[PDB]
């Protein structure tokens, strides 16, 4: 009936940037294994016994928050339904330790290797002791979300991972059918370790705050099919000539022999008739967008000219190329992306054939930056001939603020904010009773300024000042004596449309004021509260000699800086709800 108190040490978990799942699409065979070994020197620390756990999370746990949790301490894994744990004696799931029997009944002693078994079709997760099995298994669980290898650990523990790519020395043999991150793992970046749901990270000069992380056919259409198929043969012949690899007298497939030394119709039909089949299908699909082709300009056939071929250009291949001049032909790069969707769809169809029948590619939208751009450029330089022919077409916002104790009622106060990125950020002041779960400045509870779009927010947006870029340290004047709020950017006072100087005149004192900052998704930037004058970037434009005082001028400790949670806790129904009224009969 009464509240209890004790001491609990902090708990945190780490995970590499590896993801896996099962769904309709590029599954990457979804068969993988994880093997690590631990080596620690703290069997029993000062307060309690350190704990280590192993398991997986379906990218929906977000359990690690430094501080209190659903049980006693912010456990990494096994304290809910979105993670699993194995401490060497029990299995952890939702604060329930289920004991299991296995040889070597002891905790995770140093210099011990473990392995994890994963199944994608039927829910099945199992583990593996140094050389012994486990008498338990996880089964009948949902799979909505990507899975990453996660281990919970306390202070004092050192551990390393194994990858198999560059420095993964697998002491224990891999399971029969699971790969060590071979086919396609993070293809558009590298691999490393990173915490989950990290709302704060250390900075070089000062700590930074990071935001949340997420048939009938027109004859013109019919005749142009042959008029464009011939250009495809022309381009391939042109490409063959530009390669410089003449067909070799000896018939070897490994010397990059060219099987195109044959008539344009006497050739083996399956390789090119199907090749022409996509050409018509891609063209008919791309034009299937509501646009009807008609000769309403007569600027296509009259432009038919013969390109100039130097005598040295013609070579023994015997196929005359006709490439149109590109010295001054540059229509647009923007419309090239219109054909990207079909090519990605076509590659995806090609991907399905490659994977249905596995010793590979993935969806083209997220293959990799370098290759996809190169392939798109390679595809663009061939489809531009069609266009050169003369044819035309047609997850929330976290809020950061100080606590109610530091409310100010008078004086001239000032603090500095830095915007490392250039996303959606807002800085300003707010009333002590700032209700969360509402946009900054949407209601009358704050006077916030948005530097991303040059807008000021108070009961509605309004254009004010210029947008942001890299750097752009921004401060905030304030003066309750004369009831003014003034912003500064990199050493200059912002200007309004009417020429006013941060027009926020005649603001009531109210219950004092309070500094506040907000962060959009995927944004990095830290705020300085003026613990010492040195850390201030300038303090030499509007605060040095105008009577203004830095906020944390005479403190001996950092400000608490309360922030906003994510988990939906429980609250009683307020009696003054606008439209939810309960009555007890």
């Amino acid at each position: 009936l009464l509240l209890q108190t004790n001491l609990i040490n902090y708990v945190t978990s780490i995970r590499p940037n590896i993801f896996v799942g099962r769904a309709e699409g590029s599954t990457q065979y979804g068969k993988w294994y994880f093997e690590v070994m631990v080596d620690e020197v703290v069997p029993f620390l000062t307060a309690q016994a350190t704990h280590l756990r192993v398991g997986w999370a379906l990218t929906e746990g977000y359990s690690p928050y430094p501080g209190g949790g659903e049980g006693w301490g912010g456990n990494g894994v096994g304290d809910d339904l979105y993670s699993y744990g194995f401490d060497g004696l029990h299995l952890w799931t939702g604060h329930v330790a289920r004991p299991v029997t296995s040889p070597g009944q002891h905790l995770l002693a140093p210099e011990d290797v473990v392995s994890c078994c994963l199944d994608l079709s039927v829910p099945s997760i199992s583990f593996r002791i140094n050389g012994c099995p486990v008498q338990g298994v996880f089964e009948a669980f949902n799979l909505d979300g990507l899975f990453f290898p996660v281990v919970s650990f306390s202070a004092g523990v050192k551990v390393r991972f194994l990858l198999g790519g560059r420095h993964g020395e697998f002491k224990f043999l891999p399971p029969p059918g699971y790969a060590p991150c071979h086919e396609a793992v993070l293809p558009r970046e590298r691999l490393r370790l990173e915490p989950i749901k990290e709302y704060r990270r250390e900075g070089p000069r000062g700590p930074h705050l990071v935001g949340p992380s997420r048939i009938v056919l027109p004859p013109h259409l019919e005749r142009i099919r042959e008029k464009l198929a011939e250009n495809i043969h022309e381009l391939w012949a042109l490409t063959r000539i530009e390669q410089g690899w003449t067909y070799g007298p000896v018939r070897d497939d490994n010397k990059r022999l060219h099987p195109c030394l044959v008539n344009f119709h006497s050739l083996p039909e399956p390789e090119r008739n199907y090749n022409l089949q996509m050409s018509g299908e891609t063209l008919k699909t791309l034009l299937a967008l509501g646009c009807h082709v008609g000769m309403a300009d007569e600027k296509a056939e009259d432009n038919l000219k013969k390109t100039k071929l130097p005598k040295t250009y013609m070579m023994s291949n015997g196929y005359k190329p006709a490439p149109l001049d590109l010295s001054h032909v540059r229509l647009t790069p923007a419309q090239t992306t219109l054909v990207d969707r079909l090519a990605e769809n076509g590659h995806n169809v090609w991907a399905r054939d490659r994977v249905a029948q596995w010793y590979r590619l993935v969806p083209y939208r997220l293959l990799d930056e370098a290759t996809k751009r190169s392939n798109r450029d390679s595809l663009c330089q061939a489809v531009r001939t069609l266009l050169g022919y003369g044819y035309n077409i047609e997850d929330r916002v976290r809020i950061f603020r100080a606590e109610k104790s530091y409310t100010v009622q008078s004086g001239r106060w000032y603090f500095e904010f830095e915007a490392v990125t250039t996303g959606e950020m807002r800085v300003g002041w707010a009333r002590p009773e700032l209700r969360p779960d509402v946009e900054l400045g949407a209601d009358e509870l704050a006077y916030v300024f948005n530097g991303h779009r040059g807008q000021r927010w108070h009961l509605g947006s309004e254009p004010f000042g210029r947008p942001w870029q890299s750097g752009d340290v921004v401060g905030c004047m304030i003066d309750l004596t004369e009831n003014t709020i003034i912003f500064t950017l990199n050493g200059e006072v912002l200007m309004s449309d009417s020429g006013s100087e941060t027009a926020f005149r005649e603001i009531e004192i109210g219950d004092g004021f309070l500094p506040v900052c907000s962060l959009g998704p995927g944004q990095v930037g830290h705020l300085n509260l003026g613990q010492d004058v040195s850390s201030l970037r300038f303090f030499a434009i509007c605060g040095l000699q105008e009577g203004f005082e830095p906020f944390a001028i005479n403190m001996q400790r950092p400000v608490t800086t309360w922030f906003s949670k994510s988990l939906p806790q429980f609250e009683p129904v307020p009696p003054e709800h606008p439209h939810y009224e309960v009555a007890r009969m």
Partner: protein, 48 residues
């Protein structure tokens, strides 16, 4: 739970095992959501 979901909220059922698993007394334990589903219970063209 929040929103964007109404089905498949409970997972990680019990994993009890025996020598031969011949005991005919088992249940989907570890059910975090001891819930029902009324919307599928009645069937009539009225509003009672």
């Amino acid at each position: 739970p929040g929103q964007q979901g109404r089905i498949s909220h409970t997972d990680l059922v019990i994993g009890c095992l025996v020598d031969l698993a011949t005991g005919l007394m088992t249940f989907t334990a570890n059910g975090k959501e001891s819930n029902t589903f009324f919307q599928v219970e009645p069937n009539t063209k009225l509003f009672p």
